[PDB]
Design a protein around this ligand. Structure first.
Ligand code: NA
Lengths: 316, 335
């Protein structure tokens, strides 16, 4: 009878949401909230099913019923709300370019070898021998880095091997709500001395969204998380829409949290939290349909993906 | 922004103002009803000096030339404005190729236009080398360019920077440009620099000469082959094994090889002495097509956060073509 009786070993919120989901035997048809999805093989269904579970369960874009561009005005409001301006960034010095109009340092950053003005050197205080580590005042705002989004690295440098990342999602209902939420959240995070990166939708036409703001908290996530949740809890329900993803932990209306995936397997990497969880659910649902028993296929596939099936916002 | 300087040239040319039926670009009717394409480049202004060096030579060209270009109506180089006659019912070659209308015939007309272009006084022309590939970026991106790119683009740059074989091959390709017979070369060709009039049924126009130089003719040949390479191995496809993506991609290329072969026949019709003067033209063109692949993957990565497996695979095809141009030249039919 109970949603949890029939779906044992799985978080109740995912048990409840799977009642809205069925896969036909053979796995060439599926239905998610009466969004019907068909395909010519199980394998083609896996990605069509993965996408629907993502849209329906993670994003909240529903389609089973009868029913891009950077904006400089918003980029300005979002960039104005950033308390800091600079993130010290370590790389290895490759070469010192002695140009009279301004010396430049070719530095191997983790993601790219870059040519940086010498005036951005922090440590050491004079350009070292090539091969030596340097530290650089690199801008914290990165408006092009993440398409659709305005991105900021926090003042404080991130752990060398970053390690686990706590993702916090804010369901901003509009751009004005985003700027307030963005400001609030960066405040708290910098006050709490958080090691983080964050981003916010930079196209006004793309709200509302449950990941309209995303915070990436590294190291010790509890100070930043507490700080963030106190700084926005006042706006939860009003500036944030109330619904959040079934895969996440709800901290307040429209404020959810999770962890970056930690999937054991090679080739099942570089996925977002939402797509990773949806793919594993589709894989377990598909596997079910290719043979209570459904809940075990699902628990199995989540576990093989490194997801805690009692707590799918987290990883084993 | 740049509307003042554009409305001032149109006024001084007798074209009135831009009607609301239309760096930055503008196309459509003027208050006088003349169809104009307004191009703006932020400034002197060397891209416009190159554009103009083409419009001088293009004036000395019959309307029976396989190489047709929109008439220049005017220009203010110091403000970075050019105006040309809009091609009636303009359909770009990118649109055409996406709809399967960039056929073998149209590829032959492109080669004839490009073959024609390379045979046309070379005195007014820029002999500076085109920064393509960007060799300094292979060592190190400017910090300000890093802050204007996506994570996928940045990742695509680092993969090339860390690939010594490719970096070396590109330095040699650019080094070889001063050891070959140069020709008037477009230097930045893509399917979108080719326009048909009459909504896809009309004649062929080659446009965008902001990179026009006296240069290695392989740049243009390779660019055209490179577009078919990128179309066949990437565009037509955008959860599979990498070996499957390469297999599907290799078969798409093979089915697209006649497009390249046709271009090259067109090319040789109008430039029959190309290999008598440059035996290594096929090989250098293959290497340029190989780079062109990276260039096009890096550009498309603009709106991506990761490099998907199709892009990773497509890249791997370009490394093969760039590191093996001779064989690629034979595979591609530029022999
Ligand atoms: Na095609």
């Amino acid at each position: 009878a109970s949603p949890v009786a029939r779906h044992r070993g799985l978080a109740p919120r995912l048990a409840e949401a799977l009642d809205a989901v069925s896969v036909a035997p053979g796995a060439r048809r599926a239905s998610v909230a009466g969004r019907t999805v068909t395909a010519d093989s199980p394998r083609d269904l896996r990605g069509r099913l993965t996408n629907a579970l993502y849209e329906e369960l993670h994003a909240g874009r529903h389609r089973g019923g009868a029913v891009t561009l950077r904006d400089p005005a918003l980029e300005a409001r979002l960039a104005a709300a950033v308390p800091h301006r600079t993130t010290p960034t370590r790389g290895r010095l490759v070469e010192v370019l002695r140009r009279p109009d301004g010396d430049q340092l070719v530095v191997r950053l983790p993601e790219v070898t870059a040519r940086v003005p010498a005036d951005r050197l922090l440590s050491p205080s004079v350009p070292p021998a090539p091969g030596e580590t340097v530290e650089l005042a690199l801008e914290a705002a990165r408006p092009a880095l993440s398409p659709g989004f305005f991105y900021v690295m926090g003042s404080r440098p991130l752990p060398r091997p970053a390690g686990a990342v706590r993702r916090i999602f804010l369901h901003a209902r509009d751009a004005d709500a985003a700027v307030v939420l963005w400001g609030a959240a960066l405040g708290a995070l910098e006050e709490a001395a958080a090691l983080y990166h964050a981003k916010v939708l930079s196209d006004p036409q793309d709200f509302p969204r449950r990941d309209a703001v995303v915070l990436y908290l590294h190291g010790d996530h509890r100070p930043g998380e507490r700080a963030v949740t106190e700084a926005v809890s006042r706006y939860a329900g009003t500036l944030t829409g109330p619904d959040t993803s079934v895969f996440t932990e709800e901290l307040a209306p429209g404020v959810a949290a999770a962890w970056d995936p930690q999937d054991p397997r090679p080739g099942q990497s570089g996925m977002s939290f939402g797509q990773h969880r949806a793919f594993a659910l589709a894989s377990g649902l598909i596997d079910c349909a290719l043979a209570p028993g459904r809940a075990e296929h699902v628990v199995r596939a989540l576990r093989e993906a490194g997801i805690d099936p009692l707590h799918p916002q987290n990883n084993l | 922004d740049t509307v003042p300087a554009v409305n001032a040239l149109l006024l001084r040319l007798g074209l009135g103002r831009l009607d609301a039926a239309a760096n930055d670009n503008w196309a459509g009717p003027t208050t006088t009803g003349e169809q104009v394409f307004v191009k703006t480049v932020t400034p002197g202004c060397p891209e416009l000096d190159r554009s103009l060096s083409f419009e001088d030579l293009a004036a000395r060209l019959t309307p029976a030339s396989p190489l047709r270009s929109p008439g220049l109506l005017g220009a203010d180089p110091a403000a970075g404005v050019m105006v040309h006659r809009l091609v009636p019912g303009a359909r770009s070659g990118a649109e055409l190729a996406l709809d399967g209308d960039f056929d073998d015939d149209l590829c032959r007309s492109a080669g004839r236009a490009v073959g024609t272009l390379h045979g046309l006084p070379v005195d007014g022309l820029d002999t500076g080398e085109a920064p393509l590939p960007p060799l300094s970026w292979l060592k190190a991106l400017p910090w300000s360019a890093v802050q204007e790119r996506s994570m996928a683009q940045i990742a695509a740059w680092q993969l090339v920077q860390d690939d010594t074989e490719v970096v070396d091959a590109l330095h040699r390709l650019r080094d070889l440009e001063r050891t070959v017979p140069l020709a008037p070369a477009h230097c930045d060709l893509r399917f979108d620099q080719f326009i048909r009039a009459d909504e896809g049924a009309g004649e062929l126009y080659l446009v965008d000469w902001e990179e026009f130089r006296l240069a290695d003719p392989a740049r243009d040949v390779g660019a055209f082959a490179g577009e078919w390479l990128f179309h066949a191995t990437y565009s037509v496809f955008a959860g599979l094994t990498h070996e499957e993506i390469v297999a599907r991609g290799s078969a798409s290329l093979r089915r697209h090889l006649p497009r390249i072969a046709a271009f090259w026949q067109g090319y040789l019709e109008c430039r029959p002495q190309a290999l008598a003067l440059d035996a290594g033209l096929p090989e250098r063109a293959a290497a340029y097509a190989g780079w062109h692949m990276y260039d096009r993957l890096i550009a498309t990565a603009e709106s991506h956060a990761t490099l998907n497996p199709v892009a990773r695979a497509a890249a791997g095809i370009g490394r093969t073509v760039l590191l093996g141009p001779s064989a690629a030249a034979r595979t591609l039919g530029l022999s």
